[PDB]
Design goal:
part of a larger assembly, 9 chains, A mainly alpha (376), B alpha/beta (158), C mainly alpha (99), D alpha+beta (127), E alpha+beta (185), F alpha+beta (181), G mainly alpha (71), H little secondary structure (46), I mainly alpha (323), C: 99 residues, mainly alpha, 4 helices, extended, binds ubiquinone-10, binds 1,2-diacyl-SN-glycero-3-phosphocholine, binds iron/sulfur cluster, NADH dehydrogenase [ubiquinone] 1 alpha subcomplex subunit 13 (chain G), transport (chain D)
């Protein structure tokens, strides 16, 4: 018999409480993001990437800026690269915390939710101090960043890193090793590496089986090749090993954050050329050419050479890719948005096969489907 | 119509408004990317349980619908169906810009230009996303709005 | 299941017949889906479907025929899933300038 | 205002928090701004008592004290009042937004506006 | 970088279907015919030294000027040899191209998305229903000729006690700003 | 499943090396040691201090570079700071700003109409950073929830009065951030 | 001009311009203990089992004495 | 206290979650004791 | 006469205690989760239950029209009756009983047995089949864990010759039975946790999860009555736990400073500790799947309860330790 659930719509074929098959209906959050991006300039299209995969905000900005710089060939300063890495790892910590605690609530554990939200509130305070708003902060731009770090941010992040090491130990002690948690997670929605490769899994969902492949090491798109962090893999891909991988990724994100704080350089925050990066307020108010370039960059945009490329980054969900096709104009001709939730939600069908309803919700929580990015 | 019956009616209305204000049971309609900020509002810092707000998953037991996120043409019938099941004393809080006037996807197919076209919304919470501070401000504004409901007086003077 | 493009007019005609059969068999379900029994006239609905097929005869490309049949089957699935004397010139003239 | 604590419970929390606090300032609307350092967590070392116990609102904080209360600035409201601009400016007004049609903001084309302006961008012949 | 298996493919792949190749730092590109795309992807997926066994995604691009307006692009990855490859073809509105669901099971939803957005139908898809847009959607939104705001909009009709769909009558029309500079070329 | 069975047998042999280990494992699984530890941590957090913000009287920390409510400023003399350069809606990604202008009586370039939709603004600060004269600024105010969409549809007079009301805090934030520019 | 914006009272060349940005203090912060430290200092399995068994035995003896008194 | 018997609380290197107001965020961002100076170009390209 | 007065004085304070119990659950869970519970409706949220009840009363009802109107309406009535009549026997001190039945234990067991009918009829009378399936699941879980609870009652009945709770406590005078039978007390606590669908084993309250529940269709007062019945059962089984394994109205060590306390205060304090344990376990642990909890009830607690029955009987029969 068919059982319907109604922004997650899902129809399940059941025989004896055992899930024979599950079919999701996803379009409930379709918003025409690609069409709007085609209709808008690159800078005006950056907030669309802010909105996509909203739990991990600045990862999408990083991917979009990397694609634009690849199509544009502009050098980003070392300080901008380091602060981008720092905030990408902060974003990874935020997304992992939210995913783990929403999964725990769906399982039934309610209390770690608010502790991890206290941590997330600290991180969103970091976002709000460095940029405009707590969420959807258009901070990462092509060629660099919007603004420099406010003073004291590094010290506050160091204090947060220490207290957050304590918090991760705390959460792991409560959740890991619990008999109920183990019975909920182990041997639930297992995926072989061949199955993951066939269904196009990425990130934790792909390293859970143990393919032993990470994007930050295969194609280092930042100072990542100078940060000597660790990449955990799962012995037998299932919910428990994916959860442990997420915990280890939080720890390694803290490690990378400390390294970036320690070896952050002193310099500029964006690309040197004013044809591609807007000049400062003082420069545009004092210099004739700077005023011209500010006016042109805020009415028109930088005209990227006509080319097509696919740039992918290791978003906390997985591999987030943007396929940009240009025509030499100030607006992107085509922008395809490959999110690491579209493939995982396909994987739901075979993952939650011969399982039960609680196993289905556990698998959904483990895959961490954010519907904005799957409905891009 | 008198001055003592009016005082008694005012006291009864004040008691009713106090009860309805202190026992708001909103239901999340958590699409897009105001729902994460809503969960932040429900977190430890800007806690909602203090004021009486507790999220009821069943629309039949909920008091006011808080629509947070983008309303899609594919989801608007579901929103209306869920709204129709709510009890007659009911309110709507439209959080963000998508649910107010379409927000950042106003000029887009399959996007409802604000939840006002589907359900009668009482209070809009501007922001994108509105700070959890601002959403709790909107909930307090809902309390203030339902703090001036003279239901007993209106029933008496009919 | 989707099939390759029809390579012959006879194959396109057979596919059109199969689609018309599917519509006719799925007609009584639409009865309970929509509940317009007062003025439905199931025979009239069949006549209207035949009239649509007959007004779509000017097409001669088998690819266009197959695409039209695919869209018609999609529309059938949607309907099953319940998703809804002063001459012509003077009336438009009195209505608005843009006509 | 202490009798409001029994049916408020939130003013009760504020009064409990004003045990060891120091009154750092007061505004012209009556709001009393308190600071409390020492063994206090970061998020709860500055606050306000609105001096309107019945219907205190979150929008009653003037812009002069808004930043200090929200931890934007270390400057108290007195310095910002000293730095308040001249030759223009309006007094702080709360977010009424429902206290009356004569109080709320109306567009120039809204029927509730005292003066409603037509919008056609052409002048008819007007015989 | 990592242009190893691309060159090895061009050395070993049959030359019948390689319509054109592009060696770029933005991504190595193969453009072929729609008849031989399935065979080409089967060769790449199964060969021991070009093991692109994971399909990153399938995209569509609209080119109204060309005779075959639609361009179907396949981004694939080889984790064993650590390199990305791109294989694309050209399809028009009516012609159906081969489906690669059998090779890569993940291709089903991306192919449904391509159908939804452009109208390029696939030959051997297990199902090809719309995935992203509203139920009963009439057009293909990602076509260039498709208007940005669409053709219809929804609202609540009180007499019908349901949400009805009506032709668009939106206020504050989209303002297209022509920023293009005549000296950009 | 034969491989699974033999793996299970091998693991059972591995973790049953001696009677001490098997007895310890059985006692741990029977007496709920992990549950007791979780209860102890829960009790510690019950007895620890809370982080609730006490909303109406205590408000969360912010930054001078906060994107709250759109507003329009003025020069110290009193004239409108906003020339009609129309860089607002040229960069506004959501197209929430509509502006019309004409020459004033004394020949100055001023806007005769300037409205912003707060239901369409995404609160991104593109206009406030594209302003050549620092005329439009996204003010620190964010508690401006309205009961009506028409109220949320702002115009030039409302933006100007917001700027006049919040001029001092906006000026302080603008100084602090013009340092960071 | 960059020199005009970042002018120094007594600088001669465009180099050595004043600069002050967010960064580490001299010393480069402190280690933050990325790893986890969970100490298991609870009672041993044999100890709690012996405690439970002795408690059960002595409690049954006390139950017998109380039943005798009540009888 | 019962929670120091075992678990993370028993660890001597355990850090409290709540940050003190006197040590977490000393200077508000809009009032910093030292004035910033952010470079915008290399000295060569001036 | 005086019997209706006593019955009213038992019933109304029980409802007040249930209201303040849900308030205390909110407060304790919030304090666990580093936040503060209801504090804005009255001082420390003491008026929050009153505001909630008044709102529920003032909410306009809706009629599902399920062709089973009588059975739909009377199921929460049935469970409320069952909870109250179960509370009609529990003692509070020496002589504070309405019905001093010599078979008090079996009376409570029977009342617990009757408790499944309200939920079963609520699930059946609802139009939706999801509610019916959830009601069946909850009924089966209560069945299994009530079998376990009955075995624990048999253990206690082996320990104490009589069958009435007052004489049970009078036997508890010596050692409280919790010192001899702490594992039995733990198993009884988990069994009563699963009996009332509270803490782990929380199927009906997992509404955000796919299992849904039997209260989805119910209107304001139906849901309120079901909630009141569940929480009254929670307090009832906390009282059962303290009367069975903590001595009820008995002080510690029988010191004369401890005897100044009336004893009803002692019973209330023990019930409060058990309710705090209820909220503690609910807040601190995740929840079990339906199959997992059913297998655990039928394979872990039933054999252990039978083994403990046998062990206690063997210990008591062998030695002269028999009443
Ligand atoms: C988690 O979410 C939820 C909540 O949130 C916390 C809720 O509150 C509720 C609803 C819970 C309630 C407890 C509402 C019921 C409120 C009550 C006050 C219970 C009713 C009690 C009575 C009617 C007894 C009062 C009788 C009196 C005072 C008579 C006094 C007589 C004398 C003094 C002697 C003669 C004179 C639900 C369902 C819920 O699900
Ligand atoms: C002469 C007699 C001498 C007796 C000496 C002492 C022996 C005691 C043996 C029985 C212990 C009974 C109490 C524990 C129990 O029931 O465990 C069952 C079980 C232990 O086994 P288990 O079920 O967890 O094991 C997993 C499942 N299998 C068996 C397949 C491996 O406990 C539970 O299931 C716990 C469920 C959750 C409980 C949540 C509330 C906890 C409240 C605080 C507790 C402290
Ligand atoms: S209003 Fe802004 S924050 Fe809210 S859902 Fe829309 S895009 Fe996201
Ligand atoms: S902040 Fe952004 S969305 Fe709002 S008016 Fe300015 S440019 Fe437009
Ligand atoms: S950018 Fe500044 S000066 Fe230009 S229109 Fe906007 S507010 Fe006015």
């Amino acid at each position: 018999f068919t059982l319907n659930f109604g922004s997650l719509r899902l129809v399940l074929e059941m025989n004896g409480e055992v899930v024979e098959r599950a079919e999701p209906h996803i379009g409930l959050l379709h918003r025409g993001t690609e069409k709007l991006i085609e209709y808008k300039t690159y800078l005006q299209a950056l907030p669309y990437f802010d909105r996509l995969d909203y739990v991990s905000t600045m990862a999408q900005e990083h991917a979009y800026s990397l694609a634009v710089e690849r199509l544009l060939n502009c050098e980003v300063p070392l300080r901008a690269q380091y602060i981008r890495v720092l905030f990408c790892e902060i974003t990874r910590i935020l997304n992992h915390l939210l995913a783990l605690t929403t999964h725990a609530m769906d399982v039934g554990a309610s209390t770690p939710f608010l502790w991890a939200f206290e941590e997330r509130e600290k991180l969103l305070e970091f976002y709000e101090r460095v940029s405009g708003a707590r969420m959807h902060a258009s901070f990462i731009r092509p060629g660099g960043v919007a603004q420099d770090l406010p003073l004291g941010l590094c010290r506050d992040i160091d204090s947060f890193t220490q207290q957050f090491a304590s918090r991760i130990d705390e959460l792991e002690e409560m959740l890991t090793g619990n008999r109920i948690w183990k019975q909920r997670l182990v041997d639930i929605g297992t995926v072989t590496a061949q199955q993951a490769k066939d269904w196009g899994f990425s990130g934790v969902m792909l390293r859970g089986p143990g393919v032993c492949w990470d994007l930050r090491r295969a194609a280092p798109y930042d100072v990542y090749d100078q940060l000597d962090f660790d990449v955990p893999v799962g012995t037998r891909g299932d919910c428990y090993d994916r959860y442990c991988i997420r915990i280890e990724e939080m720890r390694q994100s803290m490690r990378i954050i400390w390294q970036c704080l320690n070896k952050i350089p002193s310099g500029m925050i964006k690309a040197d050329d004013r044809k591609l990066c807007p000049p400062s307020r003082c420069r545009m108010k004092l210099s004739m050419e700077s005023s011209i370039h500010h006016f042109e960059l805020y009415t028109e945009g930088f005209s990227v050479p006509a080319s097509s490329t696919y740039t992918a980054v290791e978003a906390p969900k997985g591999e987030f890719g943007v396929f940009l096709v240009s025509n030499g104009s100030n607006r992107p001709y085509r922008c395809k948005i490959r999110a690491p939730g579209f493939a995982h939600l396909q994987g739901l069908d075979f993952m939650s096969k011969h399982h039960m309803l609680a196993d289905v919700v556990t698998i959904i929580g483990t895959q961490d489907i954010v519907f904005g990015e799957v409905d891009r | 119509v008198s001055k003592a019956a009016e005082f008694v009616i005012s006291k009864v209305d004040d008691l009713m408004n106090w009860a309805r204000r202190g026992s708001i049971w909103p239901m999340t309609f958590g699409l897009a990317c105001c729902a994460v900020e809503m969960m932040h509002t429900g977190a430890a810092r800007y806690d909602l349980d203090r004021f009486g707000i507790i999220f009821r998953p069943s629309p039949r037991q909920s008091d006011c619908m808080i629509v947070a996120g983008t309303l899609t043409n594919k989801m608007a019938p579901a929103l209306r169906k869920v709204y129709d099941q709510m009890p007659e004393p009911r309110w709507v809080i439209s959080m963000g810009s998508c649910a107010n006037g379409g927000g950042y996807y106003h000029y887009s197919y399959s996007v409802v230009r604000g939840c006002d076209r589907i359900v009668p919304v009482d209070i809009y919470v501007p922001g994108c996303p509105p700070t959890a501070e601002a959403l709790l401000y909107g909930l307090l504004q809902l309390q203030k709005k339902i703090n001036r409901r003279k239901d007993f007086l209106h029933w008496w003077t009919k | 299941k989707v099939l390759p493009n029809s390579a012959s007019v006879e194959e396109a005609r057979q596919r059109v017949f199969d689609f018309f059969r599917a519509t006719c068999r799925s007609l009584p379900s639409v009865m309970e889906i929509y509940n317009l029994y007062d003025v439905t006239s199931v025979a009239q609905l069949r006549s209207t479907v035949a009239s649509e097929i007959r007004k779509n005869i000017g097409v001669s490309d088998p690819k266009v025929i197959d695409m039209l049949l695919f869209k018609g089957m999609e529309e059938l699935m949607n309907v099953v899933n319940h998703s809804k004397a002063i001459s012509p010139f003077l009336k438009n003239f009195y209505s608005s300038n843009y006509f | 205002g202490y009798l409001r604590c029994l049916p408020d419970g939130n003013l009760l929390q504020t009064k409990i928090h004003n045990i060891g606090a120091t009154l750092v300032g007061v505004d012209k609307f009556g709001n009393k701004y308190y600071e409390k350092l020492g063994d206090t967590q970061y998020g709860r070392h500055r606050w306000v008592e609105y001096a309107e116990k019945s219907r205190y609102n979150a929008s009653q904080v003037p812009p002069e004290w808004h930043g200090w209360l929200h931890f934007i600035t270390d400057h108290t409201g007195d310095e910002l009042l000293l730095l308040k601009p001249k030759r223009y400016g309006v007094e702080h007004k709360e977010n009424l937004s429902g206290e009356g049609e004569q109080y709320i903001y109306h567009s120039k084309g809204h029927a509730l506006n005292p003066g409603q302006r037509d919008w056609t961008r052409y002048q008819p012949w007007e015989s | 970088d990592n242009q190893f298996i691309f060159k090895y493919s061009w050395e070993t792949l049959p030359k019948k279907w390689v319509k054109k190749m592009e060696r770029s730092e933005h991504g190595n590109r193969f453009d072929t015919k729609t008849d031989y795309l399935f065979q080409l992807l089967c060769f790449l997926k199964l060969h021991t030294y070009t093991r692109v066994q994971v399909l990153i995604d399938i995209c569509g691009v609209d080119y109204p000027s060309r005779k075959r307006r639609f361009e179907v692009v396949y981004n694939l990855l080889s984790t064993r040899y650590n390199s990305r490859i791109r294989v694309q073809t050209s399809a028009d509105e009516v012609t159906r191209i081969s489906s690669v669901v059998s090779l890569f099971p993940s291709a089903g939803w991306w192919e449904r998305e391509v159908w939804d957005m452009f109208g390029v139908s696939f030959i051997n898809h297990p199902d090809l229903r719309r995935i992203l847009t509203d139920y009963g959607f009439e057009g293909h939104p990602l076509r260039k000729d498709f208007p940005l705001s669409g053709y219809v909009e929804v609202r609540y009709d009180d007499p019908e006690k349901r949400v009805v769909s009506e032709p668009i009558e939106m206020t504050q029309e989209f303002r297209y700003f022509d920023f293009a500079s005549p000296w950009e070329q | 499943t034969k491989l699974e069975d033999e793996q299970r047998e091998q693991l059972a042999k591995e973790i049953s090396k001696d009677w001490s280990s098997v007895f310890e494992r059985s006692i741990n699984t029977l007496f709920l040691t992990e549950m007791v530890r979780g209860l102890m941590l829960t009790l510690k957090y019950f007895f620890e201090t809370k982080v609730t913000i006490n909303y109406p009287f205590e408000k969360g920390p912010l930054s001078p570079r906060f994107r709250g409510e759109h507003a329009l400023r003025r020069y110290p003399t009193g004239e409108e700071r906003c020339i009609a350069c129309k860089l607002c809606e040229a960069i506004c990604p959501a197209q929430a700003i509509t502006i019309e202008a004409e020459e004033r009586e004394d020949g100055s370039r001023r806007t005769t109409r300037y409205d912003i939709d707060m239901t369409k603004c995404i609160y991104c600060g593109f206009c406030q950073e594209a302003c050549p004269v620092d005329a439009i600024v996204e003010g620190p105010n964010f508690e401006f929830a309205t009961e009506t969409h028409e109220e949320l549809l702002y115009d030039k007079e409302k933006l100007l009065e917001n700027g006049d009301r919040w001029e001092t805090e906006i000026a302080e934030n603008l100084r602090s951030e013009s340092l960071y520019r | 001009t960059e020199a005009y914006i970042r002018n120094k009272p007594g600088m001669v060349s465009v180099k050595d311009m004043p600069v002050l940005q967010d960064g580490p203090p001299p010393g480069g912060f402190a280690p933050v203990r990325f790893a986890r430290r969970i100490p298991n200092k609870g009672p041993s399995a044999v100890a709690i089992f012996l405690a439970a068994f002795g408690t059960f035995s002595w409690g049954m003896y006390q139950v017998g004495q109380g039943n005798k008194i009540r009888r | 206290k019962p929670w120091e018997i075992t678990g993370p609380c028993a660890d001597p290197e355990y850090r409290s979650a709540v940050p003190l107001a006197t040590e977490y965020r000393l200077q508000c961002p809009a009032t910093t004791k030292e004035k910033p100076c952010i470079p915008n170009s290399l000295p060569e390209t001036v | 006469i005086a019997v209706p007065a006593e019955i009213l004085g038992i019933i109304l304070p029980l409802l007040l205690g249930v209201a303040f119990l849900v308030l205390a659950e909110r407060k304790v869970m919030a304090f666990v989760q580093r936040r503060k519970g209801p504090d804005v409706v009255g001082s420390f949220g003491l008026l929050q239950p009153l505001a909630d009840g008044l709102k529920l009363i003032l909410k306009e009802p809706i009629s599902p029209s399920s062709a089973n109107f009588f059975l739909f309406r009377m199921a929460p009535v049935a469970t409320f009756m069952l909870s109250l009549v179960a509370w009609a026997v529990v003692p509070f001190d020496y002589g504070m009983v309405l019905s001093d039945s010599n078979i008090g234990l079996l009376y409570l067991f029977a009342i617990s047995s009757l408790g499944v009918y309200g939920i079963i009829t609520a699930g059946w009378s609802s139009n939706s089949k999801y509610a019916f399936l959830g009601a069946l699941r909850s009924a089966a879980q209560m069945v299994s864990y009530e079998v376990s609870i009955g075995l624990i009652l048999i253990t206690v009945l082996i320990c104490v010759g009589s069958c009435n709770l007052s004489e049970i406590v009078m036997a508890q005078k010596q050692i409280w039975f919790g010192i001899p039978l702490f594992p039995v007390l733990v198993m009884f606590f988990i069994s009563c946790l699963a009996e009332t669908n509270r803490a782990p084993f929380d199927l009906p309250e997992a509404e955000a999860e796919s299992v849904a529940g039997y209260n989805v269709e119910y209107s304001s007062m139906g849901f309120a009555l079901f909630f009141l019945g569940e929480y009254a059962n929670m307090i009832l089984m906390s009282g059962l736990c303290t009367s069975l394994s903590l001595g009820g109205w008995l002080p510690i060590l029988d010191l004369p400073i401890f005897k100044r306390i009336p004893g009803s205060i002692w019973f209330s304090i023990k019930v409060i500790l058990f309710l705090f344990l209820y909220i503690w376990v609910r807040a601190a642990f995740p929840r079990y799947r339906y199959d997992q909890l059913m297998g655990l009830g039928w394979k872990v607690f039933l054999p252990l309860s039978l083994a403990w029955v046998v062990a206690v009987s063997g210990v008591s029969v062998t030695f002269p330790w028999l009443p």
